Amino acid sequence: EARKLSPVELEKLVREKKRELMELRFQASIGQLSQNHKIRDLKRQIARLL
RNA sequence: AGAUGGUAAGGGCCCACGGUGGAUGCCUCGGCACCCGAGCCGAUGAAGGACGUGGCUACCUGCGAUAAGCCAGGGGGAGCCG
């Protein structure tokens, strides 16, 4: 469960990389954005052990 | 007084060359028939949909706020981000 926290973080990360854009001012478009395409998601696949 | 020619505003026929239009022929991610095979799906929420999803996205196609995708195993063997 220390898991959910890392996400809350990663979540903010993206919900930050977001406006990191908005005004076309962030040249790593894919990189740090399709980021979540795993981080925040993948490893959000927490199997309630049991 | 006598006589048969030229002139074409435009028209007619014929030849050539174009325009338009899409027959014809040749094609074919399609269709039709028949014969085999195969034959249920749903409150573990179906069939069908709405809306939303991409760094830039109108539509189509994918997916579902984990959103053109996530984990695992198997197959593959150089290109991939429809």
Side-chain angles (χ1 to χ4, degrees):
Chain A
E1 182 263 291
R3 176 183 64 84
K4 68 183 186 182
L5 178 59
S6 182
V8 171
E9 296 185 304
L10 300 137
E11 203 98 337
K12 168 110 73 181
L13 195 51
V14 49
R15 263 46 193 168
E16 185 184 66
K17 220 61 190 182
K18 284 211 284 201
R19 37 280 313 313
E20 182 65 308
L21 177 64
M22 279 40 262
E23 69 293 355
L24 60 173
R25 192 253 169 178
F26 159 79
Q27 291 179 295
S29 71
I30 286 300
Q32 318 290 64
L33 228 339
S34 196
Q35 158 259 282
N36 67 153
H37 203 185
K38 293 289 185 63
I39 19 274
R40 175 287 175 66
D41 181 314
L42 163 134
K43 291 195 171 188
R44 179 170 181 168
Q45 351 297 286
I46 168 46
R48 250 69 181 188
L49 199 55
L50 304 168

